[PDB]
Design a protein around this ligand. Sequence first.
Ligand SMILES: [Mg+2]
Length: 232
Amino acid sequence: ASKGEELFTGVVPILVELDGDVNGHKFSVSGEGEGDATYGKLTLKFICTTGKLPVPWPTLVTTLTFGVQCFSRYPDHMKQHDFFKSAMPEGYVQEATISFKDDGNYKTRAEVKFEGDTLVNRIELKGIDFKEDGNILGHKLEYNYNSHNVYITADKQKNGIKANFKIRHNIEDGSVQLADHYQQNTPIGDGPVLLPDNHYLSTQSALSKDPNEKRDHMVLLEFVTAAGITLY
Ligand SMILES: [Mg+2]
């Protein structure tokens, strides 16, 4: 267990700021909400502040929530495996490559750290090689998000962690759009961090709309629980 974990015993306010460019379609997203790691619970509202989002909202969920993996519920018996909180408050840098099968890719860079008592995530996203009337730029994905695992492994070399997982977005015709994810996280601070044994994050997400919101937006309720390492 770590000193960073003490920062997460109660409800913590969250800010997310994203600048994106996908095939030259530029956009920004701002998110606000809060996290309660005791319950692995996230409540966030994201708004496209530049007009219409040029990609489907579900394709941004992992990018927008990458940095809030510090709100995962680690069972007590697994708390020595929680890198994310151990890096706080100084934070970490995160990079990911998200490869959409038979389409383009996102590359992201982000920094997550505390700013006072708020957990702040700042993200840059670059997407290239998308098909103009593919499932992403053609907006052919359902507004939903399947439950999934995020497989974590240590990168001791680099004093950090990696994650690998596949997302299966639902296409409106009943098919699936696969998105391969590779994530790397590195501490910003010089203090010690927890380098975990292999384990995963079990994630469940519900996407909705604010009925009074006329801007392009996404309301997200997400639960994230660590598992995979195991008295009666
Ligand atoms: Mg369907």
